Design a binder for this molecule. Structure first.
Ligand SMILES: [Ca+2]
Ligand SMILES: [Ca+2]
Ligand SMILES: [Ca+2]
Ligand SMILES: [Ca+2]
Ligand SMILES: [Ca+2]
Ligand SMILES: [Ca+2]
Ligand SMILES: [Ca+2]
Ligand SMILES: [Ca+2]
Lengths: 178, 178
């Protein structure tokens, strides 16, 4: 009872719709949406710029030809990815506040397959809650979840017997923490 | 009104569950699930081996270190991917027959954002319906959809103005058809 089960949060509009959207986000009309243009399109709902770190992660996830951006085709992937996350967010934002608190966060993660202690959720919030109020906004929710799934993979490469425990040498410790 | 809008069909069980599943599919206990072991685990519901071509596509989609297979971590990705597809399948298998007919297929694709003529769905079925009855099984549904999304990307790389039309030279024609 330790690790983090199945993955997480990742298609109804036609191409024209999404092509028109693409054209708007792509302000310089360069043909490619950059970290900066995407950010201005996204909304964390807290009136602050969408967590740039998350935008980066989202960009390099759908950008194939390392071009620090995405083209139309890949964008529809970004569109879907952001959309699936919003649905996840609203599902667990139970008191309809627009922010995910600790109780909701435990529900989100439990629902993703994670089996983490209560204490850990305080750490998780403090770590990714930029707002600094114990209420996680949309963008910090994605990032925290990406980092969890991104670190759970690494852990699994090491936990050969997937028992939730591993023995590491000082270096490996740093190497994997790096 | 031509192309194929947003993408398509791609996390509740804990790691232990999926680790135990992994161990069963991984019969040779090699630590890696191969195209062959996955196939035996999957079910197209028609009592025939799961479309090997689809299994391959699914394998190389989650296999990072080109090892003709997937490890535990990546498998949870395969698990989720197969699961999301089953849900899509059941959503559009409206008469609850276990197979997707033409009317259901039009609904599936329309729901994915595609705007294709009726005639095209006959072609699509004939092309991917191995059973050969006009009823598309789960595995042939995934493959057909993968190929559509896989070919729609390519088309979009060419249709600069995303108008649903392109001018191609004989070679490009073959090159992109190759
Ligand atoms: Ca641009
Ligand atoms: Ca809330
Ligand atoms: Ca609600
Ligand atoms: Ca271990
Ligand atoms: Ca094996
Ligand atoms: Ca049916
Ligand atoms: Ca049904
Ligand atoms: Ca064109």
């Amino acid at each position: 009872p330790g690790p983090g089960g199945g993955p997480g949060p990742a298609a109804l509009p036609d191409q024209s719709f999404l092509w028109n959207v693409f054209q708007r986000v792509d302000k310089d009309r360069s043909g490619v949406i950059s970290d900066n243009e995407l950010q201005q399109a996204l909304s964390n709902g807290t009136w602050t710029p969408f967590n740039p770190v998350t935008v980066r992660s989202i960009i390099s996830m759908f950008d194939r030809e390392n071009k620090a951006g995405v083209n139309f085709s890949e964008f529809t992937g970004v569109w879907k990815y952001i959309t699936d996350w919003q649905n996840v967010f609203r599902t667990y934002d139970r008191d309809n506040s627009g922010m995910i608190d600790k109780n909701e966060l435990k529900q989100a993660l439990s629902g993703f397959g994670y089996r983490l202690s209560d204490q850990f959720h305080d750490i998780l919030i403090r770590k990714f809650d930029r707002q600094g109020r114990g209420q996680i906004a949309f963008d910090d929710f994605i990032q925290g979840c990406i980092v969890l799934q991104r670190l759970t993979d690494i852990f699994r490469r090491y936990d050969t017997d997937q028992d939730g425990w591993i023995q590491v040498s000082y270096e490996q410790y740093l190497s994997m923490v790096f």
